[PDB]
Amino acid sequence: AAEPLTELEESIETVVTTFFTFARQEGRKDSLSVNEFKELVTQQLPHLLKDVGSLDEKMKSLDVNQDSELKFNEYWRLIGELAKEIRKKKDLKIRKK
C-alpha cells in the first residue's frame, strides 16, 4: 500500500506520511479537519509560520468552497506556501542559520 518509491517520490511521500498521521487522528481519516489545522499551525508550525493566531485566513484560503476539510488539491494550496516559506521566509538575506 506504501512500498518504497523512487527518489523523487519518497520526497513527497514524506509529507503524505505526516498528512495521513494527523488525518487518521480523528473522524474522516481521508483528510485533515479544522481542529487538526488549528493545532498544527500553533503547535507544529510556530517556527514555520510567523502567525499562529490568525489561522482563520489561512484556513479559509483552503476552505474556499466551505469544505472545512483539508483534502487533496485544496491542502496543496497551503503546502505550496509552506514549502516556499521554509526557503523564502526571510532568507532573502539570511534566515536558515
Partner: protein, 93 residues
C-alpha cells in the same frame, strides 16, 4: 453481492427543497467498519457513521453520495454514487 450496501431512505434519490435524506451504508458480508462519507461534488467532513441523517437538504447539500467502507480485505472500497439531488415539488415513488 455488494461490498458496500448503500441504502437510502427515499429510494428515488431526489427530493423536494427541505427534504430529509438518510444515507444508510451497511455491509451484508462483513461487520460495519470505518465508513468514510464521500460526496462527488463538494464532500462534507462528516464523521464515519453508518446512518447519515441529512434533514432539510438545500441546493448546496446536493451531490452524488458514496460510502468508502474500510473492510479487512477491501480497504478503500467506494460504492455506487447515488445522485442525491433536489427536484420540483413532488415525491419519488
Amino acid at each position: 453481492l455488494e461490498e458496500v450496501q448503500l441504502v437510502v431512505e427515499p429510494e428515488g434519490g431526489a427530493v423536494a427543497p427541505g427534504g430529509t435524506v438518510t444515507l444508510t451504508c451497511e455491509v451484508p458480508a462483513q461487520p460495519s467498519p470505518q465508513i468514510h462519507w464521500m460526496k462527488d461534488g463538494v464532500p462534507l467532513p462528516l464523521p464515519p457513521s453508518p446512518v447519515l441523517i441529512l434533514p432539510e437538504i438545500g441546493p448546496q447539500d446536493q451531490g452524488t453520495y458514496s460510502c468508502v467502507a474500510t473492510h479487512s480485505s477491501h480497504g478503500p472500497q467506494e460504492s455506487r454514487a447515488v445522485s442525491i439531488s433536489i427536484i420540483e415539488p413532488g415525491e419519488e415513488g
